[PDB]
Amino acid sequence: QIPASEQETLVRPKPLLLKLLKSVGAQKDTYTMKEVLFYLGQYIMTKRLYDEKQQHIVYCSNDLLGDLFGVPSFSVKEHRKIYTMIYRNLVVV
Numbered sequence: 001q002i003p004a005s006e007q008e009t010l011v012r013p014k015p016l017l018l019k020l021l022k023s024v025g026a027q028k029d030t031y032t033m034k035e036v037l038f039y040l041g042q043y044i045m046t047k048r049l050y051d052e053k054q055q056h057i058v059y060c061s062n063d064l065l066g067d068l069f070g071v072p073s074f075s076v077k078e079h080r081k082i083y084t085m086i087y088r089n090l091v092v093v
């Protein structure tokens with residue numbers, strides 16, 4: 001539900017939303033929104049932060065991710081929510 005003209009928004013992550021990204025294979029400092037989302041996706045996948053039965057729900061209560069987003073869990077179905085939650089950990093270049 002996010003226009004493609006918004007996921008290309010050149011952006012760059014703050015100190016540890018960056019740490020989050022490079023810990024899963026990142027090596028740049030300036031990303032586009034979907035690059036960020038793609039890596040955050042790999043991150044959720046690798047630490048298995050999702051509910052094993054209703055896999056559209058993510059648990060980040062006791063994870064770094066939780067500190068970045070400020071919520072204990074969220075649904076990957078609510079794109080806008082995810083974006084604004086990601087926006088606060090980055091400057092829009």
Ligand SMILES: Brc1ccc([C@H]2C3=C(N=C4NC=NN42)c2ccccc2O[C@@H]3c2ccc(Br)cc2)cc1
Nearest residue numbers: 037038040041042044045050055056076079082083
């Ligand atoms: Br916004 C946004 C962009 C892409 C998705 C992806 C996606 C997942 N499941 C769907 N279903 C349709 N699209 N997606 C998905 C589910 C479990 C584990 C990793 C996943 O990786 C990502 C995703 C989800 C949350 C964040 Br934080 C970043 C990427 C979700 C929200």
